[PDB]
Design a protein around this ligand. Structure first.
Ligand SMILES: Cc1ccc(O)cc1-n1c(N)c(C(N)=O)c2nc3ccccc3nc21
Length: 272
């Protein structure tokens, strides 16, 4: 019959019998953190060990072999990243009934959620720490030839004491493939050319969005203006000379000239 199988590249409180699924039997749904076409994310306490975790499950069963391989790839991308202080850590993953489950550590609200609740520009002190934490994460990914390709506030999750972690590695590619959010896409991605530089540009717009409380454009003339090498004067007025200068480096239209994550972390302004 149907049974959950581990996905990688047993739990008391769950009996192979009974109609309830492994997720329903071996976990306690505390609350729903999000839901969408991807599926649903729940904050849960596991009947196995009682600790707190976050679990993401796909919406509908696998349509076919390619849909299954695409969904399972996020687990593989998670494992290539390995454990890192600024990366959402995956505990375990399994599949049952054509549904894919990912169990990760529990984190705070997304950077998008957190900015929504405050409804204004974040204090530059918070911005620099978040910029640092994600640059540390990007430097970790880029050192292994991995490109996140979906850096945005929704995929950055806050941690205790003002820290944050990069998450959602569903679009991660290994150099040597999927549609991203156009609001945060690097200019060279339109003409193809994939590289680690794309994440730095995406992170620049995320920081530029959260530090200025500005809504990034999906397309049109405004989309182009953010990629000519200058910042919109209206929103970027409050930026300090240092922050504005770091953003200009990250928003450098030419990927050959754009600063790397390791380079930015070596700048004077960015000090642990
Ligand atoms: C479950 C999961 C799997 C892989 C990954 O990279 C991140 C998460 N994830 C977490 N680890 C989350 C958390 N608050 O701890 C969380 N919250 C989300 C809210 C809305 C939409 C998606 C979310 N996804 C989340």
């Amino acid at each position: 019959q149907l049974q959950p199988r581990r996905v990688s590249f047993q739990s008391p409180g769950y009996d192979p019998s009974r109609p309830e699924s492994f997720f329903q039997q071996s976990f306690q749904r505390l609350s729903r953190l999000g839901h969408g076409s991807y599926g649903e994310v729940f904050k849960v306490r596991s009947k196995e060990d009682g600790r707190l975790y976050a679990v993401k499950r796909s919406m509908s069963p696998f349509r076919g072999p390619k849909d299954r391989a695409r969904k399972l790839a996020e687990v593989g991308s998670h494992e290539k990243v390995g454990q890192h202080p600024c990366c959402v850590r995956l505990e375990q993953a399994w599949e049952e009934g054509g549904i894919l489950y990912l169990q990760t550590e529990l984190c705070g609200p997304s950077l998008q959620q957190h900015c929504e609740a405050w409804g204004a520009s974040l204090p530059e002190a918070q911005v620099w720490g978040y910029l640092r934490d994600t640059l540390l994460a990007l430097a970790h990914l880029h050192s292994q030839g991995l490109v996140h390709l979906d850096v945005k506030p929704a995929n950055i999750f806050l941690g205790p004491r003002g820290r944050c972690k990069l998450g959602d590695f569903g679009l991660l590619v290994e150099l040597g493939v999927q549609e991203g959010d156009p609001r945060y896409m690097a200019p060279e991605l339109l003409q193809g050319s994939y590289g680690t530089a794309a994440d730095v540009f995406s992170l620049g717009l995320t920081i530029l969005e959260v530090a200025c409380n500005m809504e990034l454009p999906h397309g049109g003339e405004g989309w182009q203006q953010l990629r000519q090498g200058y910042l919109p004067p209206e929103f970027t007025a409050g930026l300090s000379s240092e922050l504005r200068s770091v953003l200009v480096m990250m928003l450098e239209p030419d990927p050959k000239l754009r600063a790397t994550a390791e380079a930015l972390l070596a700048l004077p302004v960015l000090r642990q």
